[PDB]
Amino acid sequence: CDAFVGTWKLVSSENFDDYMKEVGVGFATRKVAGMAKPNMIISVNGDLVTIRSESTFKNTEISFKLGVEFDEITADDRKVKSIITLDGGALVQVQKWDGKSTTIKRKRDGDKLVVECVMKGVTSTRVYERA
Amino acid sequence: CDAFVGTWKLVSSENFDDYMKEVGVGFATRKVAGMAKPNMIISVNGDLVTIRSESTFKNTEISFKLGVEFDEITADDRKVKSIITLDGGALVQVQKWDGKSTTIKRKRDGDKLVVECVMKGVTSTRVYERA
Ligand SMILES: CCCCC/C=C\C/C=C\CCCCCCCC(=O)O
Ligand SMILES: CCCCC/C=C\C/C=C\CCCCCCCC(=O)O
């Protein structure tokens, strides 16, 4: 888990407006969210992992234990059930709500944190680097 | 093991001339070795790890499997028996020769590869970063 610890700044985004659309995100929300360029701050305190996201759009924060399901209000205000695991060296988050799901894979790849989000066939990719 | 993969350049050295002395390294060898500023290249091919070190002083290379003892000729021409493990998230190498030993711990710490070498109480520290 310590490989993910640090402050990370957005470096690139691809197909994100398409992903948010499949999730159900509204037009005006999709617009300011794409313009954000947020900083992802990941920390660990004992067995508790915290993933914070900061921008002018929104500031969210989840705190969780690996493999323990938790309630989460997403940045676009969906109420979901979330489970995060360590799986092939990546942090894999599955979010479930209203019979649907999406998967948010966070992995290391050289000096980059690579976040890929999938929702029944629509994939977006966001690369972060160390701020 | 993929956290260690890449090219790494020397960034800092501390107490290295003292460590080499306790190991048994000669004067003239100690002098050019301290001036080197080498690049450490770590790669993996299946279950085989390769750690290469390149400089004007010397170019060495070890290839090994985790937890399997192997013969190694060091940069200063000691013939040793070496075992490398993954232990607390660090690559830990123990080198044995002539009833002696030294330990070479390689660990990640933010964006740095931190190599610490110990020989009965004399410790040196070398920090590398991604070239
Ligand atoms: C770090 C938060 C990025 C800003 C998110 C802004 C709006 C998000 C709204 C709906 C989609 C949810 C985001 C899911 C992917 C995590 C963000 C990332 O893949 O990086
Ligand atoms: C990467 C090789 C560095 C150059 C080494 C030059 C001379 C070494 C001679 C005797 C001491 C052996 C080095 C043991 C520590 C590994 C090097 C490092 O801690 O970084």
Side-chain angles (χ1 to χ4, degrees), chain B residues 2-20 22-122:
Chain B
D2 282 356
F4 297 94
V5 170
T7 302
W8 302 93
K9 45 179 251 176
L10 193 75
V11 138
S12 81
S13 187
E14 303 199 297
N15 214 30
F16 187 53
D17 200 61
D18 295 280
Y19 166 76
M20 283 193 288
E22 221 64 56
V23 166
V25 183
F27 185 96
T29 303
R30 278 205 323 278
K31 242 47 45 180
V32 292
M35 295 166 188
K37 288 183 277 176
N39 274 218
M40 197 186 280
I41 304 155
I42 301 185
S43 54
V44 178
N45 208 127
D47 64 350
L48 194 70
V49 186
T50 291
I51 295 173
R52 202 161 48 135
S53 154
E54 302 216 316
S55 56
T56 337
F57 160 66
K58 220 154 240 206
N59 305 275
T60 71
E61 188 190 319
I62 49 157
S63 262
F64 60 89
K65 305 184 173 215
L66 291 177
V68 178
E69 188 197 37
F70 67 99
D71 297 307
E72 171 192 4
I73 305 298
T74 64
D76 59 302
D77 290 296
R78 290 170 296 135
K79 186 175 169 177
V80 309
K81 295 283 208 155
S82 265
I83 177 94
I84 303 187
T85 56
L86 194 72
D87 176 0
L91 286 168
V92 180
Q93 174 174 15
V94 179
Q95 283 179 345
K96 290 166 111 193
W97 80 110
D98 301 345
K100 320 201 217 70
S101 56
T102 184
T103 291
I104 301 167
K105 197 182 140 184
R106 295 178 175 93
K107 63 166 172 162
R108 305 299 335 280
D109 184 88
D111 52 30
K112 303 297 197 306
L113 201 154
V114 174
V115 188
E116 99 180 59
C117 320
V118 192
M119 169 100 219
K120 67 239 227 299
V122 176

Side-chain angles (χ1 to χ4, degrees), chain A residues 60-72:
Chain A
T60 71
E61 188 190 319
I62 49 157
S63 262
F64 60 89
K65 305 184 173 215
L66 291 177
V68 178
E69 188 197 37
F70 67 99
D71 297 307
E72 171 192 4

Side-chain angles (χ1 to χ4, degrees), chain A residues 110-111 130, chain B residues 110-111 130:
Chain A
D111 52 30
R130 279 199 197 286
Chain B
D111 52 30
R130 279 199 197 286

Side-chain angles (χ1 to χ4, degrees), chain A residues 37-117:
Chain A
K37 288 183 277 176
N39 274 218
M40 197 186 280
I41 304 155
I42 301 185
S43 54
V44 178
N45 208 127
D47 64 350
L48 194 70
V49 186
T50 291
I51 295 173
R52 202 161 48 135
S53 154
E54 302 216 316
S55 56
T56 337
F57 160 66
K58 220 154 240 206
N59 305 275
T60 71
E61 188 190 319
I62 49 157
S63 262
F64 60 89
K65 305 184 173 215
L66 291 177
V68 178
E69 188 197 37
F70 67 99
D71 297 307
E72 171 192 4
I73 305 298
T74 64
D76 59 302
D77 290 296
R78 290 170 296 135
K79 186 175 169 177
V80 309
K81 295 283 208 155
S82 265
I83 177 94
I84 303 187
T85 56
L86 194 72
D87 176 0
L91 286 168
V92 180
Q93 174 174 15
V94 179
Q95 283 179 345
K96 290 166 111 193
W97 80 110
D98 301 345
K100 320 201 217 70
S101 56
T102 184
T103 291
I104 301 167
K105 197 182 140 184
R106 295 178 175 93
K107 63 166 172 162
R108 305 299 335 280
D109 184 88
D111 52 30
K112 303 297 197 306
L113 201 154
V114 174
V115 188
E116 99 180 59
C117 320

